[PDB]
């Protein structure tokens, strides 16, 4: 640390404590598999829509598995995973649609 507690107190007194204030503020396996995905290869640098999902300025060729990973990252960026993707008798009655019958 090489800082005294009294020195840290003089720090918090003289200079301010915005960093610690911000700190106190901000306190299933895949069942089936394919083989065509391993066999595939696509040119990210070639296709202009796929140009925007590569990582470095070297990624042009990619197999279908890592390609699927990039598309999954890009889908998650465009639309986040909603919280409902992550019994009670009355709640079961509400969620049953046989009850609301005219």
């Amino acid at each position: 640390a090489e800082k005294d507690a009294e020195e840290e107190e003089l720090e918090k007194f003289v200079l301010g404590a915005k960093e610690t204030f911000r700190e106190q503020l901000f306190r299933d396996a895949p069942a089936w598999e394919d083989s065509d995905d391993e066999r595939l290869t696509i040119s990210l640098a070639g296709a202009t829509r796929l140009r925007k999902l590569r990582i470095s300025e070297s990624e042009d060729l990619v197999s279908g598995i890592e390609y699927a990973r990039r598309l999954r990252q890009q889908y998650l960026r465009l639309y986040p995973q909603p919280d409902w993707a992550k019994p009670l008798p009355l709640d079961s009655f509400l969620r049953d649609a046989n009850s609301f019958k005219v």
Partner: protein
């Protein structure tokens, strides 16, 4: 006057003061001190008096120590809300809502009113968190503290379900329970707001018999009135 309408929309959604008179008025709006001294009252003495009140609150109950760390600190003397980003503002909204649910039990005491006076005069709860602040002051709707909060509330920040307090802000008299339950049985929004507030408090285990009796009474009279509205005789309509 389409231009005037869009501009008034911008002016109501605006949050920061931008000329000196608007700054002086928005700093003059206060709970405890009269506005004549609330204009000329700077932030050091405010923090001194309200920190004394918050100290009395910590010697009342135990769980005010995290807010001693993060909301009533010597850096919160200085921090300005409108210069932080949206996510810092959201985290601040969460901390404010936690403190309001916590302070809702002991609101009839001068220590708690001093703490809320700090939160209003520095973090501008009455302009940024009107929903939760107004729901927390709602169960005490007879006391002069609620009358003053009704005074200092800005008219356009009041959300839609609580927009029935306009005649009382016009004439500063505390609204009666007949008015609250009547607005509850007409709008489902106020009823859902009160129930959401109280269920949030009871999940956070900071409830108290005053709030629980208030919520029970309002929803009971509200369900009575709502069924008395819903009864309509035609079989399909009542179904």
């Amino acid at each position: 006057s389409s231009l005037a309408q869009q501009l008034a929309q911008i002016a109501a959604n605006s949050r920061s003061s931008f000329n000196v008179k608007a700054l002086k008025a928005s700093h003059s709006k206060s709970l405890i001190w009269e506005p004549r001294v609330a204009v000329s009252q700077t932030f050091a003495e405010i923090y001194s008096q309200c920190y004394e009140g918050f100290k009395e609150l910590c010697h009342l109950d135990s769980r005010f120590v995290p807010f001693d760390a993060t909301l009533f600190s010597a850096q919160s003397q200085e921090v300005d809300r409108t210069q932080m980003t949206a996510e810092e503002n959201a985290a601040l909204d969460k901390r404010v809502d936690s403190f309001l649910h916590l302070v809702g039990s002991r609101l009839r005491l001068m220590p708690a009113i001093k703490a809320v006076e700090w939160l209003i005069r520095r973090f501008r709860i009455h302009e940024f968190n009107t929903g939760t602040l107004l729901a927390t002051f709602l169960p005490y709707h007879t006391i002069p503290a609620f009358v003053t909060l009704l005074s200092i509330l800005p008219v356009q920040r009041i959300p839609i379900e609580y927009r029935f307090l306009d005649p009382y802000i016009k004439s500063l008299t505390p609204p009666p329970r007949a008015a609250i339950v009547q607005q509850a049985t007409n709008r489902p929004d106020l009823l859902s707001a009160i129930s959401r507030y109280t269920l949030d408090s009871c999940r956070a285990k900071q409830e108290y018999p005053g709030l629980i009796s208030f919520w029970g009474g309002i929803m009971a009279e509200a369900v009575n009135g709502m069924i008395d509205k819903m009864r309509s005789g035609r079989r399909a309509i009542q179904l």
